[PDB]
Amino acid sequence: MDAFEKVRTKLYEIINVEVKHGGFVYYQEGCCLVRSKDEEADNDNYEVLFNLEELKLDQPFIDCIRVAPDEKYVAAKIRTEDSEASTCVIIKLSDQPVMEASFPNVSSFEWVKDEEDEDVLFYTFQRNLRCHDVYRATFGDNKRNERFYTEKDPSYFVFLYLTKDSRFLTINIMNKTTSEVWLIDGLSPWDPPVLIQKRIHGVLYYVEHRDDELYILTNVGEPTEFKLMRTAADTPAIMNWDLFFTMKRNTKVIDLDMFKDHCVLFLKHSNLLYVNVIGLADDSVRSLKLPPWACGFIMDTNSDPKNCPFQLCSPIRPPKYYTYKFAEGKLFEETGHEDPITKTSRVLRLEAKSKDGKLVPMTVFHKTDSEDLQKKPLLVHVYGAYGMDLKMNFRPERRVLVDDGWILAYCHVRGGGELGLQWHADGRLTKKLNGLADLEACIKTLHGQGFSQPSLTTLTAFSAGGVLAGALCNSNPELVRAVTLEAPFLDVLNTMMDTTLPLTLEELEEWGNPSSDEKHKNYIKRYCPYQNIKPQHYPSIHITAYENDERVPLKGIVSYTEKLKEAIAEHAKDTGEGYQTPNIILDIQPGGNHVIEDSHKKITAQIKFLYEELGLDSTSVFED
C-alpha cells in the first residue's frame, strides 16, 4: 500500500489535532493540552492537563494524541517547528494532571487495554538514526520500559497501529516495496509478539483484524495489483491466505475502514475515485454512487464500529461530509448545507496525447456560463515526480479564480503515481523527458482543443514541480505568459554534483547520482533548467522563496534568478528595442510560515502578479 491513509500519515500550513475519546475532546488551546466536554459549552471551558513550556522547547505544538482506555493517562506527541526532534509526553489524568514520563524521538505510539487492568504504552524510536526499537511502558507499579523488538535494518521504517476492535497491535516494519507485520495480543500484551510472515522482498501487506480472522491488504504475487485476503488468527502464514476481494490494476488504496460485519474500502483508479462496502460473511459488494465533481477524499482515521464517515472535496468545492450509515443504506449531504459550486462547474477528466504516444490524464474544470467566443486565462499545475499524485484538496485561492472566469488544469504527468507504479517508473531522472513529453502535450492539447492561448496561459509549481516548470521555460517558453514558483527546484545538477553536505537519501533513487556516474551527467544535463538557460524570451516569474528550507537550497534558486536576469539581458542587449523584458520577481521570505495569514497573503502577491502580467482588473473579494 503506497499512499495508504495510515502509511502517509506516518510517512504547507498547520493542521489541527483534535482527538475525541470518552466524551472528551483533547487538543491544545495556547500551547497547553486541555480537555473539553464533547460539545464545547464556550470556547473557554476546558480542563488544563499539561502546559507545553514544561519541556523548554521552541514553538511546540501537538502532533497527535492517543488516549488510554482507562483515561488514567494520556500520551501526546510534542513536535516543534524549525527543528527535527519530538517528545512523547504522558500525563496522568487524576484530580491533578501531572506528567510522569516524556520519551524523545518517538515516531508512533498506542495504548493497550491490558488483562491486568493497567494502561500499557507501546512506542517506537530510532537509535542514532540507525534502527528502531519497540518498548513497553507502564505507570502503575512503575515497570519502566522493556525493549521486546529491535528492527535491525536502517532502510526499514517501523510504525505501530491498533486494529479498530483493539484485538491486536500491529508492529509494521515497512519499506517502499516490502513490509512485515507482527502481532501483539490485545488481551495479553506481555506475551511475545507473533510474526505473521517473514518479509518477502517486493510484497507489501497491511493487517486488520475483525472476528478471529485477519483481513490482509497485500500485493503478493503482483505489485501492480492489490487485493484483500483472509486468514485465521491461529494460521496467519502466507500459505493460508485466501483471496477475498480483487482490485483493478494500478488502483490506489487510500483507506480501509473495517466494521463489525463489513469492510469499506476507499480507492482511486486513474483520476476517478471509488468507495465500496464489502460484506465479510455474505458476498455483499456495492460501489457507492459518487458525484462527478469530486476529485479527492478527506479521511478521518477515527470511526465508530457502525458508521463510515468520509468527506469529498475538489480544488474548488469545499469538503462535503458523508457517511455510510451502516444500519440504514448510506446517507450523504449533511442537511442542506451545500455550496452552488456545482451549478456552473465543469469537472472534466480529459486525456493528452504525449509525443511518445501515451494517454496522459489531466483534469480541467471551470465555469460553464463563461461565454465560449472569448478565452479566459488558464493556470495549469504539475508535479510528475516522487510518485505523488497532484493534490486535489480545496484551495480557496482557486475558487476565487474560477469564479472570476479562470480555467484550472491539473496535469498528472509521468513521475507521479496517478496511473500506478508504471506511471512513476517513467518520468524519473533517466526518463524525466517523458515528464516534459506529457506536460508539453497537455498544454498543447488544451490549446488545440480551444481552451486558452499562450498569451493567457500560466502555470504554478511547488518544489519538485519546479523542475518541469523551469525546464518548460527553456523548452517551449512560447506556451506560457507567467509562472509562479513556490520554493522551486532548478539547478538539480549544481545541487547534487556539488555534494558539499547534502544528505540526499531518496533523491538519489529519484534523481540519479551525478557526482559518480557518466550517464547520470549526460541525461540530467538535457533537462536541468539551470543548464539549458538560453538567452531568449521568457514568461514572467514570481518566486515566493523561503530562506529557511533544507529540501531547497536558497543558493540554488537565488543563483537561478540572477543567471536568468543575465540571460534575458544578453537577449535584451541583442534586440533591445521594444522587446518587453519579462518581469522576474524573487520575494525572499524568512523562516517557515508561522500563521495562515502570511501564506494566504503571499497568495495575494501571487494572484496580483498574475493579474498584472495579463491586466484583468481585480476581483480579490473573499474571506481569507
From Swiss-Prot:
Pfam families: Peptidase_S9, Peptidase_S9_N. Changing residue 600 to A: No effect on catalytic activity. One of its GO terms (biological process) is retrograde transport, endosome to Golgi. It is found in: Cytoplasm, Cytosol; Golgi apparatus, trans-Golgi network; Cytoplasm, Cytoskeleton; Golgi apparatus. Keywords: Acetylation, Congenital myasthenic syndrome, Cytoplasm, Cytoskeleton, Disease variant, Golgi apparatus, Hydrolase, Nucleus, Protease, Serine protease. Its main location: cytoplasm. Its EC number is 3.4.21.-. Inhibited by PMSF and Prefabloc, as well as leupeptin at high concentrations. Partially inhibited by TPCK, a chymotrypsin inhibitor and E64, a cysteine protease inhibitor. Not affected by 4-amidinophenyl-methanesulfonyl fluoride (APMSF), pepstatin or EDTA. Inhibited by 1-isobutyl-3-oxo-3,5,6,7-tetrahydro-2H-cyclopenta[c]pyridine-4-carbonitrile. The active site is at residues 463, 549, 594. The keyword Lipid metabolism does not apply. GO terms for cellular component: cytoskeleton; cytosol; Golgi apparatus; mitochondrion; nucleus; trans-Golgi network. GO terms for molecular function: peptidase activity; serine-type endopeptidase activity. Belongs to the peptidase S9A family. Homodimer. Interacts with the AP-1 complex. Serine peptidase whose precise substrate specificity remains unclear. Does not cleave peptides after a arginine or lysine residue. Regulates trans-Golgi network morphology and sorting by regulating the membrane binding of the AP-1 complex. May play a role in the regulation of synaptic vesicle exocytosis. This is Prolyl endopeptidase-like. It comes from Homo sapiens. The lineage of its organism: Eukaryota, Metazoa, Chordata, Craniata, Vertebrata. The gene is PREPL.
